[model samples]
Target: SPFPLTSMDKAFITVLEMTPVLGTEIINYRDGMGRVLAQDVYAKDNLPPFPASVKDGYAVRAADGPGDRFIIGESQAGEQPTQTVMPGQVMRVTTGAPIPCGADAVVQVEDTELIRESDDGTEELEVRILVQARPGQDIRPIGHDIKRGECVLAKGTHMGPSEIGLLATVGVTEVEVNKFPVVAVMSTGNELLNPEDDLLPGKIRDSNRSTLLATIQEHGYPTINLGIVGDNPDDLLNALNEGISRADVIITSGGVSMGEKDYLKQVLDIDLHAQIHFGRVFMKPGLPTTFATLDIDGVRKIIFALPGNPVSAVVTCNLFVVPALRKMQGILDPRPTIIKARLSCDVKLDPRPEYHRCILTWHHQEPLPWAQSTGNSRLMSMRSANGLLMLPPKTEQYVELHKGEVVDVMVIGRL
Candidate 1:
């Protein structure tokens, strides 16, 4: 008898349940993009710290109606002005410059005509106020953008460009962010050769190593390349041992299927004492996908033994490994983003659930995004695919998916 297969839903649950191997470090805010906030970041002071003018105009009191007013002085940005606006008096101010004392509104330069000026034309001596000034108009009050000691970013929040900008606004020079896990990637089998080497009679180039590494790096996790190993059990065991010692997660691209060359399950179970959570899954293109864990030094280390096919490796990595990475960093939504799209063509259902790669298009056919299958399992099929049709498996009374049928599409790439 063999071990029972696990459903894709349950396998995802196990992956999310693994404890996060989180560490902490303080780094400059400039280098904080794509990092998780480890602590709540507070604003040090009020934004602007003073009442500022919103336009290059004259700051005046509303009580002084539309009439000729004497220009007292000027206030430019980054300058501290000693002159203050009095009754029937105004101050020339530039945009972002602080409002003069006793002023409540700003009259844009376009609305006012400069009647008199100095010989050098640098100062406006008198001006006719065109628009009626209103109180608290065109003026940013103190603390208008952000108040002092406010929580700008909370714990567990993922930092991106916006967060970085916020940190800059709050004057946070350094911040604490959650640490990323160290991932080790490798490929197995004797027929795989490096890209630099010449092609041989029975060998093919190993592409999974580079592809998986790029995928991991795209999500901000650090990775180590264990390089390629042969089909011998001793070599595989040594590579696995090395990964277990150094990495937080181990990802291998081959040797998990039914073939004799597939010895990953045997080595993990017999020699490494790792518990195989699920050796099989009820999914097409990656039926032999495996997820397991082993206890080393009182910590849980995860391993994802992906299928050998190139597309299968890419799909499983996006569907499973990517989520694990997000979960480790405490991301709220730890699954691939999905969107609704109309099926452009017909598709036959398989007994096992299928994630048909698709090229999403926007045509006048319908209002929703349209999806066309990229054919099944062919490496070229994934070339321009941006999403996957979440196709259901066929049952005893099942029928084929008809044209224009709407289905959920998992977003794996740009649309």
Candidate 2:
């Protein structure tokens, strides 16, 4: 029997029904590298609360130009100006120094000449009248960068270096950020062997465990590897129960497909009151995917069963796991921003929705092209690339993406 096509909207809506499990802990700013913000952060005071100079120059009245020469007063960054500029006088001000009270314009040091040294040890400065002086030139007004009482950082924002710096500017020593959700990752297959043990003729090491672990870590979450489980129902049931008791979400690869030994879906329904939906989205590389949810110990926990193939596993992880993790972290906009690019060469795609893996390079005056290749999942055709090109569904013939055309690119892995 043919599998029913599942719409992308339905798949996402079903996944969103699973509620996120919450936990809290206090960590310092240095340790809060990837944590999500839990509360709104307000600025304590205005940034640069005083009118300051934006460059190293002489502060003078706007009316004072070519003919008028003014004696300079002492003014530097940290030191305050003792003498004010009278009607044709100026003050030698450095970058970031507070502008004098009566000064209206500043002339750059390069544009002016030191005319004479007065007996009082004050230097007179003058400039050629090539350009008219404008009022408030080169002056950064108070609260230019940030204003006091402003909601500088909103809740649900991911804390990065820039965000930390913003908070520091507002004198915020600590921030309330959302807690990280715990994910329990496991693999189930009779043919799967531990990587530490020697591989036999017909056995393969458990690659999904390490792969999923890295994926979870990249998204800023703590992962617990529950090891490998065979095709036995009792062993699988025990592992599932234990994992659900400890984790907010559970991810298992293999044993959910239609096979004699595949019993993950059946055991989940029988042992744990889980609602499992087997989906075959019209997408290549990742067709057989299963989603299930259950209330374990009065807490709702979600589970995703992915295919055993490496490419399939990674594709499903990107499509499903990435968004789920982002939602769990309280991110409102978790979707990866798709960039338009071009195809460097002719490529054939399946007549179904599929994510083609390709290397992206920038073409001058044209959108970037994702170069497609047919090598090992890890060995891409081009090594000097940064992103993935997304080919939509039902692409048959090898379309020639001209030298300067546009296509969508998905940024993945290390830049």
Candidate 3:
């Protein structure tokens, strides 16, 4: 018996067809990092709401420049000047300080030599101007950086450090952002043991659950750990029931393959009435991966039945689960960012399209991020790996990727 396997593109298209989860919560801008904006954030007032000095200089009329001028008053940052500059008078102003009214140009202090100074050298009393002043020289006009009533950060924008800093410039203390979905993570099979439990001859310490849960947590989604369920259908069914009742998305590693003990797929399809959207994928390291959807209490429950292998679990999680989570939180173009990289080492292509983990060394272009593969699928291979090389299947035309040949790489970790 043969089952129809879905291509990577078509599989994700089906995954994306499921509606994005809808919900919003207000959080402080500092706490909103990596979250998606639910509403537009606008500037309440103009940046530098009044004319401001761009440099430590004298605010003067163009006609009063290139000559000896009497300093009428001083304007340092955070102070307002009472005296307006007359024809032969100038005001001492510091960077970010408001310009004197009726003055349109600023001559930097370097351009003017001091002829006389008050007891405080910071304030100029009489200065000899050496440069000709233009109408708007060195003075940043009101609304120079941002304008009132303009969108500071658009809706659906991913709130990063830069966006958060920008939101602060507009005096936004709190922000409205899409709430992260709660993910329920569980591991199956009798060959599993908790971290505290000693590893026996047949049991492998359960790394998949912690791995998947941490990966989900990295993106800010809260996770409910259902712990380990043995190779019993009744146990799996109960664990899944608990997950579905609470978590918005359920992630189960192991028990998805063809082994007799593998019963997650059967239980999901039979007991929960879940439509196994695709049980097989045309990819390496995770060929038996399955994705399904079930309607519970008017909400679509997304269940990702990832393979049991350590490398397979990580690969499928990055490629599929993270993107779905990002989309659910209102992030458009949620797929991992792919960059073109020049091969730093020779590599053989697998029979199936493989997401080969690698460490990307970026030194600008050459338009390339040099890559070296995380050898074999030994779980240890992924150590320090920051990128995934999207390797095409081995064919007559493409059997191996030679050093220096360009390839698409997805950024998974830091550069």
lDDT of each: 0.85, 0.73, 0.86
Q: How displaced is residue 315 in candidate 2, in Å? A: 1.5
Top candidate when judged by TM-score against the true structure: 1
Per-residue lDDT over 230-345 for candidate 3, one digit per residue giving the tens place of the 0 to 100 score: 98878888998999998889999987888877887888888878888899899998888899998867788899999999899999988889889988887877777999888887
Candidates 1 and 2 compared by TM-score, better number: 1
Candidate rank order under lDDT = 3, 1, 2
Candidate no. 3 TM-score: 0.92
Query: In model 3, which runs have C-alpha deviations exceeding 4 angstroms?
Result: 119-123, 363-367, 376-383
Question: In candidate 2, what are the lDDT values of residues 295-324, reduced to their tens digit?
Answer: 656667888888878778877777777777
Compare the candidates by lDDT and give the number of the best one: 3
Clashing pairs in 3: none
**Runs with alpha carbons beyond 4 Å of true place in candidate 1:** 19-21, 364-366, 375-383
Residue 414 lDDT in candidate 2? 57
Cα lDDT for residue 179, candidate 2: 68
